[PDB]
């Protein structure tokens, strides 16, 4: 298909986010590459405004599910690649249990041969010394299942999942995710049967990088459909 064919090799990625969380305004730029053949992502993000005012882990899901590996027998269920190159809008509400929420609106599309994710993020209702604004979350990341369903009147998809952020005291900060995706272009997209994406992520630091930053290595496989 046109869209899937754009992902058979290594594709460079750019991420650009502007955020406002409880009036703390910040921006992040990221770069790296994806290899959807292996479900593989490598990205490095820089906060360009100084110190990031929320913990890096809380932004991982916001910072390109077209790089998930869809098994061959599941090709017909890959909405994300089918919207390319024109792209899709991706919107979420991320509800941090007993704390505030993020609302995000992003557009994921090609600019030339580069896959771009441009995001606007708004966070409200955060506690000044909760786990987010108080920076109480460990610098690590768990493995999740992203449950996808068709959203036929939008010509797109929805997703619902729970992200678990470990807290430095050993507890966990839940971040409920609700997601909607809508194609931007006029080409045919794929409306999938129910399925999920199996995720795993590893966070690290670049020892020579003195700006506030995050290095992310991520592997994602679509699953839940046998034939
Ligand atoms: Mg720049
Ligand atoms: Mg079917």
């Amino acid at each position: 298909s046109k869209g899937e064919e754009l992902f058979t090799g290594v594709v460079p990625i750019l991420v650009e986010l502007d955020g406002d969380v409880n009036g703390h305004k910040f921006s992040v730029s990221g770069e790296g590459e994806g290899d959807a053949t292996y479900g593989k992502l490598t990205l490095k993000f820089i906060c360009t405004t100084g110190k990031l005012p929320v913990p890096w882990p809380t932004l991982v899901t916001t910072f390109v599910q077209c790089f998930s590996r869809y098994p061959d027998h599941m090709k017909r269920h890959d909405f994300f690649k089918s919207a390319m190159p024109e792209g899709y809008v991706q919107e979420r509400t991320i509800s941090f249990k007993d704390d505030g929420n993020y609302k995000t609106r992003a557009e994921v599309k090609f600019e030339g041969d580069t896959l771009v994710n441009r995001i606007e993020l708004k966070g409200i209702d955060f506690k000044e010394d909760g786990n987010i604004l108080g920076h109480k979350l460990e610098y690590n990341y768990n493995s999740h299942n992203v449950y996808i369903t068709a959203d036929k009147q939008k010509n797109g998809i929805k997703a619902n999942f729970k992200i678990r952020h470990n807290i430095e005291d050993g507890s966990v900060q839940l971040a409920d995710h609700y997601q909607q995706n809508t194609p931007i272009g006029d080409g045919p997209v794929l409306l999938p049967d129910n399925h999920y994406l199996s995720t795993q992520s590893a966070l690290s630091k670049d020892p020579n990088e003195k700006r506030d930053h995050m290095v992310l290595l991520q592997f994602v496989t679509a699953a839940g459909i046998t034939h």
Side-chain angles (χ1 to χ4, degrees), residues 1 3-50 52-74 76-96 98-151 153-157 159-179 181-209 211-227:
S1 86
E4 192 272 347
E5 289 215 351
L6 300 171
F7 292 90
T8 58
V10 174
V11 175
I13 301 167
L14 300 169
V15 180
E16 292 293 340
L17 176 148
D18 294 317
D20 173 334
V21 174
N22 278 39
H24 297 268
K25 298 175 178 183
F26 57 100
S27 303
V28 175
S29 296
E31 305 182 14
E33 69 187 30
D35 199 357
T37 298
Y38 311 99
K40 174 174 195 175
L41 285 166
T42 302
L43 289 168
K44 176 178 172 187
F45 302 97
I46 297 300
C47 178
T48 62
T49 50
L52 191 72
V54 297
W56 283 106
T58 71
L59 298 181
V60 167
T61 56
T62 295
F63 298 147
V64 291
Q65 293 170 311
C66 48
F67 292 103
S68 302
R69 186 179 65 85
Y70 276 74
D72 179 72
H73 73 276
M74 293 179 65
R76 73 184 171 106
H77 303 291
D78 185 353
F79 165 83
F80 303 104
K81 295 185 189 59
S82 79
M84 298 295 163
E86 296 96 338
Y88 53 77
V89 182
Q90 178 163 297
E91 290 164 288
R92 297 210 177 95
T93 298
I94 299 170
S95 304
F96 294 93
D98 300 317
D99 208 336
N101 60 89
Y102 299 159
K103 285 186 176 282
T104 63
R105 185 184 195 284
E107 293 194 7
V108 184
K109 71 178 186 152
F110 280 83
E111 297 286 0
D113 300 307
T114 299
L115 186 286
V116 173
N117 181 19
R118 290 180 175 90
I119 311 127
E120 180 182 358
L121 178 154
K122 188 67 168 290
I124 67 173
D125 302 333
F126 288 88
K127 290 177 179 177
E128 276 75 25
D129 193 46
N131 295 318
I132 290 83
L133 292 176
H135 293 281
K136 312 184 184 182
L137 297 184
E138 294 187 342
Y139 189 72
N140 55 33
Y141 212 85
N142 291 310
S143 300
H144 305 104
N145 290 333
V146 171
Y147 295 101
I148 298 173
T149 50
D151 193 3
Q153 297 193 276
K154 299 270 325 285
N155 199 205
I157 63 162
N160 297 263
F161 51 106
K162 289 175 176 284
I163 294 295
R164 293 170 266 113
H165 298 295
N166 285 13
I167 304 169
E168 63 191 17
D169 66 356
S171 189
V172 58
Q173 171 68 69
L174 173 63
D176 285 301
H177 283 55
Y178 184 59
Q179 175 179 337
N181 294 62
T182 312
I184 297 169
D186 74 351
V189 310
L190 297 174
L191 303 179
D193 291 355
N194 292 2
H195 65 285
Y196 55 87
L197 309 177
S198 182
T199 66
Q200 67 189 92
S201 304
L203 313 187
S204 59
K205 296 296 188 181
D206 172 357
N208 294 310
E209 181 57 73
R211 295 171 290 179
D212 198 8
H213 71 284
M214 167 170 69
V215 177
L216 170 64
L217 174 64
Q218 186 172 90
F219 296 91
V220 182
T221 307
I225 294 180
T226 48
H227 299 69

